[PDB]
Design an enzyme around this catalytic site. Structure first.
Site, PDB file in Angstrom:
ATOM      1  N   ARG A 185      35.879  59.181  15.854  1.00  0.00           N
ATOM      2  CA  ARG A 185      34.786  59.607  15.023  1.00  0.00           C
ATOM      3  C   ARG A 185      33.605  59.857  15.931  1.00  0.00           C
ATOM      4  O   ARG A 185      33.578  59.295  17.026  1.00  0.00           O
ATOM      5  CB  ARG A 185      34.334  58.494  14.045  1.00  0.00           C
ATOM      6  CG  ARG A 185      35.413  58.149  13.021  1.00  0.00           C
ATOM      7  CD  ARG A 185      34.920  56.961  12.168  1.00  0.00           C
ATOM      8  NE  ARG A 185      36.020  56.543  11.278  1.00  0.00           N
ATOM      9  CZ  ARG A 185      36.055  55.394  10.647  1.00  0.00           C
ATOM     10  NH1 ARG A 185      34.968  54.632  10.608  1.00  0.00           N
ATOM     11  NH2 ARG A 185      37.171  55.025   9.988  1.00  0.00           N
ATOM     12  N   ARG A 189      54.154  67.023  15.410  1.00  0.00           N
ATOM     13  CA  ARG A 189      54.084  65.571  15.642  1.00  0.00           C
ATOM     14  C   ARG A 189      54.737  64.868  14.483  1.00  0.00           C
ATOM     15  O   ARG A 189      54.378  65.119  13.294  1.00  0.00           O
ATOM     16  CB  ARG A 189      52.644  65.153  15.780  1.00  0.00           C
ATOM     17  CG  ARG A 189      52.525  63.624  15.788  1.00  0.00           C
ATOM     18  CD  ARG A 189      51.110  63.276  16.265  1.00  0.00           C
ATOM     19  NE  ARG A 189      50.893  61.836  16.245  1.00  0.00           N
ATOM     20  CZ  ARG A 189      50.138  61.134  15.418  1.00  0.00           C
ATOM     21  NH1 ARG A 189      49.269  61.721  14.625  1.00  0.00           N
ATOM     22  NH2 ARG A 189      50.270  59.806  15.408  1.00  0.00           N
ATOM     23  N   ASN A 220      42.951  61.755  17.217  1.00  0.00           N
ATOM     24  CA  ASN A 220      42.883  62.127  15.788  1.00  0.00           C
ATOM     25  C   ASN A 220      41.382  62.290  15.505  1.00  0.00           C
ATOM     26  O   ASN A 220      40.600  61.407  15.931  1.00  0.00           O
ATOM     27  CB  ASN A 220      43.487  61.049  14.902  1.00  0.00           C
ATOM     28  CG  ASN A 220      44.972  60.936  15.043  1.00  0.00           C
ATOM     29  OD1 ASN A 220      45.612  61.728  15.727  1.00  0.00           O
ATOM     30  ND2 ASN A 220      45.539  59.956  14.318  1.00  0.00           N
ATOM     31  N   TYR A 257      38.677  63.159  12.125  1.00  0.00           N
ATOM     32  CA  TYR A 257      38.444  63.605  10.747  1.00  0.00           C
ATOM     33  C   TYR A 257      36.941  63.673  10.416  1.00  0.00           C
ATOM     34  O   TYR A 257      36.612  64.660   9.715  1.00  0.00           O
ATOM     35  CB  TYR A 257      39.086  62.615   9.752  1.00  0.00           C
ATOM     36  CG  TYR A 257      40.601  62.677   9.779  1.00  0.00           C
ATOM     37  CD1 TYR A 257      41.373  61.902  10.650  1.00  0.00           C
ATOM     38  CD2 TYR A 257      41.257  63.516   8.913  1.00  0.00           C
ATOM     39  CE1 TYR A 257      42.769  61.996  10.663  1.00  0.00           C
ATOM     40  CE2 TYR A 257      42.605  63.579   8.891  1.00  0.00           C
ATOM     41  CZ  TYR A 257      43.379  62.840   9.733  1.00  0.00           C
ATOM     42  OH  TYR A 257      44.744  62.885   9.617  1.00  0.00           O
ATOM     43  N   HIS A 301      54.018  54.441  14.144  1.00  0.00           N
ATOM     44  CA  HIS A 301      53.051  54.831  13.128  1.00  0.00           C
ATOM     45  C   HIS A 301      52.975  53.764  12.049  1.00  0.00           C
ATOM     46  O   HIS A 301      53.078  54.066  10.850  1.00  0.00           O
ATOM     47  CB  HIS A 301      53.237  56.235  12.646  1.00  0.00           C
ATOM     48  CG  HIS A 301      52.065  56.951  12.083  1.00  0.00           C
ATOM     49  ND1 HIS A 301      51.604  58.145  12.615  1.00  0.00           N
ATOM     50  CD2 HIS A 301      51.320  56.670  10.996  1.00  0.00           C
ATOM     51  CE1 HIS A 301      50.633  58.587  11.860  1.00  0.00           C
ATOM     52  NE2 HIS A 301      50.428  57.704  10.861  1.00  0.00           N
ATOM     53  N   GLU A 351      50.284  58.922   0.989  1.00  0.00           N
ATOM     54  CA  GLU A 351      49.077  58.670   1.750  1.00  0.00           C
ATOM     55  C   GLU A 351      48.832  57.175   1.773  1.00  0.00           C
ATOM     56  O   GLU A 351      48.677  56.548   0.728  1.00  0.00           O
ATOM     57  CB  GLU A 351      47.889  59.387   1.123  1.00  0.00           C
ATOM     58  CG  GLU A 351      46.551  58.951   1.721  1.00  0.00           C
ATOM     59  CD  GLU A 351      46.362  59.210   3.170  1.00  0.00           C
ATOM     60  OE1 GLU A 351      47.257  59.880   3.788  1.00  0.00           O
ATOM     61  OE2 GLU A 351      45.307  58.826   3.679  1.00  0.00           O
ATOM     62  N   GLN A 355      55.549  57.885   5.665  1.00  0.00           N
ATOM     63  CA  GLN A 355      54.983  58.785   4.696  1.00  0.00           C
ATOM     64  C   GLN A 355      55.904  59.857   4.186  1.00  0.00           C
ATOM     65  O   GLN A 355      55.648  60.365   3.066  1.00  0.00           O
ATOM     66  CB  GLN A 355      53.686  59.393   5.252  1.00  0.00           C
ATOM     67  CG  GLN A 355      52.646  58.332   5.557  1.00  0.00           C
ATOM     68  CD  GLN A 355      51.365  58.885   6.153  1.00  0.00           C
ATOM     69  OE1 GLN A 355      51.255  59.035   7.377  1.00  0.00           O
ATOM     70  NE2 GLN A 355      50.456  59.191   5.269  1.00  0.00           N
ATOM     71  N   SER A 391      43.091  50.980  13.922  1.00  0.00           N
ATOM     72  CA  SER A 391      43.353  50.803  12.508  1.00  0.00           C
ATOM     73  C   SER A 391      44.120  49.587  12.096  1.00  0.00           C
ATOM     74  O   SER A 391      43.638  48.874  11.187  1.00  0.00           O
ATOM     75  CB  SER A 391      44.175  52.019  12.011  1.00  0.00           C
ATOM     76  OG  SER A 391      43.438  53.237  12.207  1.00  0.00           O
ATOM     77  N   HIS A 438      54.950  46.719  -1.755  1.00  0.00           N
ATOM     78  CA  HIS A 438      55.719  46.050  -2.803  1.00  0.00           C
ATOM     79  C   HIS A 438      55.092  44.707  -3.177  1.00  0.00           C
ATOM     80  O   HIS A 438      55.153  44.357  -4.367  1.00  0.00           O
ATOM     81  CB  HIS A 438      57.158  45.927  -2.387  1.00  0.00           C
ATOM     82  CG  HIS A 438      57.887  47.237  -2.423  1.00  0.00           C
ATOM     83  ND1 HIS A 438      57.466  48.355  -1.759  1.00  0.00           N
ATOM     84  CD2 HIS A 438      58.948  47.571  -3.148  1.00  0.00           C
ATOM     85  CE1 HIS A 438      58.281  49.357  -2.008  1.00  0.00           C
ATOM     86  NE2 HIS A 438      59.216  48.907  -2.842  1.00  0.00           N
ATOM     87  N   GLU A 444      45.776  64.790  14.962  1.00  0.00           N
ATOM     88  CA  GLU A 444      45.593  64.873  13.524  1.00  0.00           C
ATOM     89  C   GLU A 444      44.187  65.462  13.321  1.00  0.00           C
ATOM     90  O   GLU A 444      43.245  65.087  13.988  1.00  0.00           O
ATOM     91  CB  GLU A 444      45.578  63.552  12.754  1.00  0.00           C
ATOM     92  CG  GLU A 444      46.903  62.795  12.823  1.00  0.00           C
ATOM     93  CD  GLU A 444      46.980  61.515  12.051  1.00  0.00           C
ATOM     94  OE1 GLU A 444      46.177  61.363  11.100  1.00  0.00           O
ATOM     95  OE2 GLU A 444      47.874  60.684  12.369  1.00  0.00           O
ATOM     96  N   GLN A 465      46.576  55.363  16.238  1.00  0.00           N
ATOM     97  CA  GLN A 465      45.236  54.905  16.019  1.00  0.00           C
ATOM     98  C   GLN A 465      45.110  53.424  16.295  1.00  0.00           C
ATOM     99  O   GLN A 465      45.131  52.608  15.391  1.00  0.00           O
ATOM    100  CB  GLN A 465      44.853  55.159  14.542  1.00  0.00           C
ATOM    101  CG  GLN A 465      44.875  56.612  14.229  1.00  0.00           C
ATOM    102  CD  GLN A 465      44.297  57.018  12.890  1.00  0.00           C
ATOM    103  OE1 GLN A 465      44.219  58.212  12.673  1.00  0.00           O
ATOM    104  NE2 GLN A 465      43.869  56.056  12.068  1.00  0.00           N
TER     105      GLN A 465
HETATM  106  O1  GOX Z   1      44.293  59.955   5.784  1.00  0.00           O
HETATM  107  C1  GOX Z   1      45.002  61.068   6.355  1.00  0.00           C
HETATM  108  C2  GOX Z   1      45.844  60.642   7.540  1.00  0.00           C
HETATM  109  N1  GOX Z   1      44.878  60.053   8.460  1.00  0.00           N
HETATM  110  C3  GOX Z   1      45.302  59.187   9.417  1.00  0.00           C
HETATM  111  N2  GOX Z   1      44.367  58.801  10.293  1.00  0.00           N
HETATM  112  O2  GOX Z   1      43.098  59.116  10.159  1.00  0.00           O
HETATM  113  C4  GOX Z   1      46.721  58.618   9.580  1.00  0.00           C
HETATM  114  O3  GOX Z   1      47.190  58.495  10.927  1.00  0.00           O
HETATM  115  C5  GOX Z   1      47.673  59.351   8.663  1.00  0.00           C
HETATM  116  O4  GOX Z   1      48.828  58.518   8.572  1.00  0.00           O
HETATM  117  C6  GOX Z   1      46.942  59.543   7.310  1.00  0.00           C
HETATM  118  O5  GOX Z   1      47.848  60.072   6.341  1.00  0.00           O
HETATM  119 ZN    ZN Z   2      60.742  49.934  -3.729  1.00  0.00          ZN
END
Ligand code: GOX
Ligand code: ZN
Ligand code: NAG
Ligand code: NAG
Ligand code: NAG
Ligand code: NAG
Ligand code: NAG
Ligand code: NAG
Ligand code: NAG
Ligand code: NAG
Ligand code: NAG
Ligand code: NAG
Ligand code: NAG
Ligand code: NAG
Ligand code: GOX
Lengths: 499, 499
Positions: free
Chosen positions: B257, B93, B326, B328, B139, B462, B37, B188, B54, B407, B185
Site C-alpha cells: 500500500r 499466477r 500485490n 490495491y 496462499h 473471496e 478460492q 496478512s 466451517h 495482484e 502477502q
Molecule cells: O481481495 C482481493 C484479493 N486480494 C488479496 N490481497 O490483497 C488476496 O491475495 C486474494 O486472495 C484476494 O482475493
Molecule cells: Zn463444507
C-alpha cells in the site's frame, strides 16, 4: 401368549394392542442421533467425516450432501429436547463430537470450553425434562488431525488419545450421564472405512477402489477392529476404575443382524450362516466375552488376525456393563469363495458367505427396507422376527447381557414431498413390528433388554446418502431447519409411549 | 511525457491511448488466482481455510460461503486455460494447495499422486498455450493437521514442513515452472490470522474477539511473521542451492500500500505515515534486504519482537530473486495511541497510526474501491498514483529489485444481476488507471517491473466475503459454474493485450 406379524399388513400400530405398558414399568423408550449427522461444523474442529465427504463428494451421498449445517442442532438443541418432551420420551441417545471438545484431537493440546458448555446445556436440559441420556463417545467423527498424524484407528496411538478424550467426557459430564457408549457399531469402521471405503476415512486396496488414498482391504479391517477393541477396553477400564463414584454404566455399540440360510436344507448354506454369525457378531463379541477372536476367524484369517497378549485379553474380556445393540435387518447367507490372493481381496470375503434378502426358493425375507434405484436387485428388505432372534442369541451365546436397543428405524425417500414424508405409515409399521417382537422375546426368553431408542429423532445427514433419504420420527425442512415436526410415526410413538 | 488520471472520469480504457505496446516487448500480462478460492475440496485434504470457514461461518462471509465447491477449477481447469488463451495472456499466477499434494501435511506421510497430476496437467496446458506460470506455494491454505499439531506458523516446526513441501513442488514442477512465489502477502496471516482473527486460523486475544479459540494479538503476529520469514528464506535457499539447474526465480509476495499523511502539514501525521511504511512494508522488507527488522519496530515492539541469530539474518537477507508486489490501495495515516498494556492490544496498534481514506480537509483519496453497507464511513477508496509511489519507493528504498505485480483488481457487488455484473466498467477504470501509472513509473523512474497479473481470472470465493463480491475479469454463474465468460473488463483486457 404374544403373536407378532412378520408380513404386511401390520396391525401393531394400534396402541390398544401394543404400547409402553406392554413392557416393564422401568423400560426406557426414546430416540437416537449422532453428532456429525445433526450438529453442523460451527463451533468445532474438523473430523474425518468432514474430510471424507469433502475429498470424495460422490461418496458423501448422491446429492453430495454433508454434515456442514444439517439440522443445526448446534443452534437448535432445545428444539431436539422439545421433540423428546412432546414424545414423553424417557431416553435420548446422542453422541459427543470429539472435534467439538478437543478440536486438536490430543487432550494436552487444549479443550474447547464452549464445546463443553454446549453438551452441558444439552444434558442439563434433558435431565430437566426427565430424559435419561445415553451418550456415545465415538460415532465415527474422528478429529482429522489424528487421521493425518497416524491414520487414526490404524495405529495403536489411538488408544491413549481416545482414553484421554473419554476421561475428559467422564470428568465433565459423568455426574449427570449414567449411560455411556464407547464406539458406535464396532463392525462398521473396519469394513466400510478400511475395507470397501464407503465410509470415512476411505482407505482400501487400490483395485477395490482406485479413489482410495491408501490402504489394504485385506489387512487393515483387522488392524482397525483390534485397535477399536483395545481402545474401547482401555476406556471401560478407566471408567470402572476412576469413575465408579458416578454410579453409571458403559458399553460398546454393536451393529446386529440375524442371519438365516439362503437354503435351509443345504449344509453349505447353513455353514455359511453360522460363519456369518461368527464373522459379523463374534469378531467383537468373542473378544468382549472371552478375550479371543472366534476360532473360525483365527483359522481363516491366519496371520492377518492380530493376537491379544494376555494383558490385552484380560482388558478386553468382560469390558462392558451392558451392550447397546443396534438392529435393522437380517440377511440370508450362502457360500462364497474367499480369494485371499486376489488383489481385490477384502476382509469381508473371509467369512465365505454371500448375503441376500431373497432365499433359494425366491422368498423375499420381509417388507421393503431400502430401495436402490440404480440396482433394484440390491434392495434391502426387513425381517421383524430378526430382533427376537438376535436378542435370544445374545442371551444364549453371550452370557445373558444387559441390553439397550440403541438404534432401530427405517428411511423414506428424500424425493417424497413434505406431505408424503409426514405420512410415514411405513415407519410406524417398521417400528411397531419390531417392538412387538422385542416385547415377545423379553417375555418368552427373558432377555435382559431395558430400553429402546429408535433411529432417528429427526431427519439428518445420513452417512453415505446425504439428504436423499429421511430417517426421522420428526420432519425437518432443509430450506429452513429450525422446526422438527412430528410425523405420523412420531405421533404414533407418542401414543405408544403414553397410551 | 505520460499523463495519467487520478480521478473519475477515466479515459484509459481506450486502447488507442494505452495498450500492451506502451510497455516493453517482453512485459508479461495476465491474471491471478489462488487454490482455496477456485479449486474446491474434491481430491484434497482439509486446510485451515476449510477449518476456519466451517468453525466460524460468519467469518467466512456474510453468506457463510466457503471454498467447498466454488468455481470448481479442479474439474474445469481447462476452462481457466481457455480464458487465458482468449485473453492472449502471457502469464498466469495460481497457487498450489499444499493439502492437495501432501494431504497429511508432513511429506514423509506420503504424497497424493493424483494431486500432483492435477498440477502437472494445468502447467502443461498453460505452457502449450504460451502462458508463463507464476506459482504461489502458499496462499494461506495450510493443512489443518499442521495447525492442530503445532499451531502452524506459530511454531518453528513449520519451517521444515514448509521446506519439504516446497522441495516436492520444485522436484515435480520446476522443470516447467520458472517463477515461484513463496508466501502470499507476508503481512496478512500475522495480522488477520493471529491479530484480528478475521482470517484463518482465527487466533486472537480473548477481549479482541471472544470467539477466537486461543491466541494473543499482541505477541503472536510477531512470532508468526518471524516464522514466515524463516520458512520463506529456508525455501529460497533450498531453491537456489538445489534447483539452480532449473533456471528459475523465486520470491515472496508482499501486500503493498502507499501511505500519505492525513494532514500533510502536521509533523505528527507525517511521522505516522513514515511509521506505517516501516511497520507495513519494512516489517518484511527490512529482513529481506538487511537481515533485521526496522529500528522503529525494534524500539516500539521491544521484547515482543523476535531476534534473528546471525545465521538466520544471513539466511533471510537477500532471500529473493524478485518481489511479487500485490497492490490495491493507499491510506492516509494520522497518529494513534499504542496502549500496550490494554487487554485488547494488537500488534497492529504498534505502528501508532490510524488509517483512513479521507484526509483532514475532507478529501477522499480517489474513487470508490469497496462499499461497506453496514458502516459506510468504512468504505475503501482507491488511488491510482499509489502504484507509482509504491514502485518508486521499492526501487529507492529496497535496492532496485526485479518486480512482478502479482495482484491488482477491484470487486463489484454480488447483489448485481448478471447483466450488471458483466458491465463492469468500474473494473476497466480501475485496471487501466493503475496500468497507466505503472507504465509511467517504469518510464520515469526506471523501476524494474517485468509483468502484471490482475486479480482475478474469474469470480471465486473471496476470503472474508464469500460470494457477496466478484473480482473476476470473467463471470461465473454460481448455479452452474462451468463457464467463465469474459466481462467488459476481460474484453477490454483482451484488446489491451492485443491492440
Ligand atoms: O481481495 C482481493 C484479493 N486480494 C488479496 N490481497 O490483497 C488476496 O491475495 C486474494 O486472495 C484476494 O482475493
Ligand atoms: Zn463444507
Ligand atoms: C391405554 C391402553 O390402551 N393400554 C393398552 C392395554 O389396554 C392393553 O392390554 C395392552 C396390551 O399389551 O396394551 C396397552
Ligand atoms: C485408567 C486408569 O486406570 N487410571 C488412572 C490413573 O492412571 C491416573 O493416575 C489417576 C489420576 O490421573 O486417574 C486414574
Ligand atoms: C403428557 C403425558 O403424556 N404425560 C405422561 C404421564 O401422564 C405419565 O404418567 C408418564 C409415565 O407413564 O408418562 C408421561
Ligand atoms: C494498435 C494500437 O492502437 N496501438 C497503440 C499505439 O498506436 C499507441 O501509440 C500507443 C501509445 O502508448 O498505444 C498503443
Ligand atoms: C536446503 C538444502 O540446501 N540442501 C539439501 C541437502 O540438505 C540435501 O542433502 C540434498 C539431497 O537431499 O538436497 C539438498
Ligand atoms: C489472437 C491474438 O490476438 N494473437 C496475438 C498475436 O497476433 C500477437 O502477435 C501476439 C504478441 O503480441 O499476441 C497474440
Ligand atoms: C466419483 O469420484 C471419484 C473421485 O473421488 C472418481 O474416482 C469416481 O469415478 C467417481 N464416481 C463415478 C461413479 O463417477
Ligand atoms: C474382483 O472383485 C470383483 C468384486 O469383488 C469381481 O467382480 C471380480 O471378478 C474380481 N476380480 C478377480 C480378478 O477376481
Ligand atoms: C423458519 O422456520 C421457523 C420455524 O417455523 C420460522 O419461525 C421462521 O420464520 C422461518 N424462516 C423463514 C425465513 O421462513
Ligand atoms: C458470529 O459467530 C460467533 C461464534 O463463532 C459469535 O461469537 C458472534 O457473536 C456471531 N457474530 C454476530 C455478529 O452475530
Ligand atoms: C478496546 O479496543 C476497542 C477497539 O480497539 C476500543 O473501542 C476500546 O476503547 C478499547 N478498550 C479499552 C479498555 O481500552
Ligand atoms: C451448465 O453450463 C454449461 C456451460 O454453459 C452447459 O453446457 C450445461 O448445459 C449447463 N447445465 C445446466 C444443467 O444448465
Ligand atoms: O442408516 C441409519 C443409521 N444406521 C446406523 N447403523 O445401522 C448408524 O449408526 C446411524 O448413524 C445411521 O444414520
Amino acid at each position: 401368549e404374544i403373536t407378532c406379524q412378520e408380513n404386511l399388513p401390520f396391525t401393531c400400530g394400534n396402541t390398544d394392542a401394543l404400547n409402553s405398558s406392554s413392557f416393564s414399568s422401568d423400560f426406557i423408550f426414546g430416540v437416537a442421533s449422532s453428532a456429525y449427522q445433526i450438529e453442523g461444523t460451527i463451533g468445532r474442529g474438523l473430523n474425518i467425516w468432514d474430510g471424507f465427504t469433502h475429498r470424495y463428494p460422490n461418496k458423501s451421498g448422491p446429492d453430495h450432501g454433508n454434515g456442514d449445517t444439517t439440522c443445526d442442532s448446534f443452534s437448535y438443541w432445545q428444539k431436539d429436547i422439545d421433540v423428546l418432551d412432546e414424545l414423553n420420551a424417557t431416553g435420548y441417545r446422542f453422541s459427543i463430537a470429539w472435534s467439538r471438545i478437543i478440536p486438536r484431537g490430543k487432550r494436552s493440546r487444549g479443550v474447547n470450553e464452549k464445546g463443553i458448555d454446549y453438551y452441558h446445556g444439552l444434558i442439563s436440559g434433558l435431565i430437566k425434562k426427565g430424559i435419561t441420556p445415553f451418550v456415545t463417545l465415538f460415532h465415527w467423527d474422528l478429529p482429522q488431525t489424528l487421521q493425518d498424524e497416524y491414520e487414526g484407528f490404524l495405529d495403536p496411538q489411538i488408544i491413549d488419545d481416545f482414553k484421554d478424550y473419554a476421561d475428559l467426557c467422564f470428568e465433565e459430564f459423568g455426574d449427570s450421564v449414567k449411560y455411556w457408549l464407547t464406539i458406535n457399531q464396532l463392525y462398521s469402521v473396519p469394513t466400510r472405512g478400511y475395507g470397501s471405503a464407503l465410509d470415512a476415512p476411505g482407505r482400501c486396496s487400490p483395485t477395490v477402489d482406485p479413489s482410495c488414498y491408501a490402504g489394504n482391504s485385506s489387512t487393515e479391517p483387522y488392524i482397525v477392529a483390534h485397535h477399536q477393541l483395545l481402545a474401547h477396553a482401555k476406556v471401560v477400564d478407566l471408567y470402572r476404575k476412576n469413575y465408579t463414584h458416578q454410579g453409571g454404566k458403559i458399553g460398546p455399540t454393536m451393529i446386529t443382524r440375524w442371519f438365516l440360510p439362503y437354503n435351509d436344507t443345504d449344509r453349505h448354506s447353513i455353514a455359511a450362516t453360522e460363519r456369518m454369525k461368527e464373522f459379523f457378531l463374534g469378531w467383537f463379541m468373542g473378544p468382549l466375552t472371552n478375550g479371543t477372536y472366534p476360532q473360525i476367524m483365527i483359522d481363516t484369517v491366519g496371520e492377518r488376525l492380530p493376537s491379544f497378549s494376555p494383558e490385552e485379553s484380560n482388558l478386553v474380556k468382560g469390558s462392558y456393563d451392558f451392550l447397546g445393540l443396534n438392529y435393522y435387518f437380517t440377511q440370508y447367507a450362502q457360500p462364497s469363495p474367499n480369494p485371499v490372493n486376489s488383489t481385490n481381496h477384502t476382509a469381508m470375503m473371509d467369512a465365505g458367505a454371500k448375503l441376500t434378502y431373497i432365499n433359494a426358493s425366491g422368498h423375499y425375507i420381509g417388507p421393503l427396507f431400502e430401495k436402490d434405484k440404480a440396482d433394484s436387485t440390491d434392495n434391502i428388505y426387513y425381517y421383524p422376527k430378526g430382533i427376537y432372534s438376535v436378542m435370544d442369541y445374545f442371551k444364549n451365546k453371550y452370557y445373558n447381557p444387559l441390553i439397550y436397543v440403541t438404534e432401530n428405524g427405517i428411511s423414506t425417500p428424500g424425493d417424497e414431498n413434505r406431505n408424503q414424508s409426514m405420512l410415514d405409515y411405513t415407519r410406524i409399521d417398521y417400528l411397531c413390528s419390531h417392538l412387538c417382537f422385542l416385547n415377545k422375546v423379553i417375555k418368552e426368553k427373558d432377555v435382559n433388554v431395558k430400553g429402546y431408542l429408535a433411529w432417528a429423532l429427526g431427519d439428518n445427514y445420513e452417512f453415505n446418502k446425504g439428504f436423499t433419504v429421511r430417517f426421522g420420527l420428526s420432519y425437518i425442512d432443509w430450506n429452513n431447519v429450525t422446526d422438527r415436526d412430528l410425523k405420523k410415526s412420531g405421533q404414533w410413538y407418542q401414543s405408544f409411549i403414553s397410551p
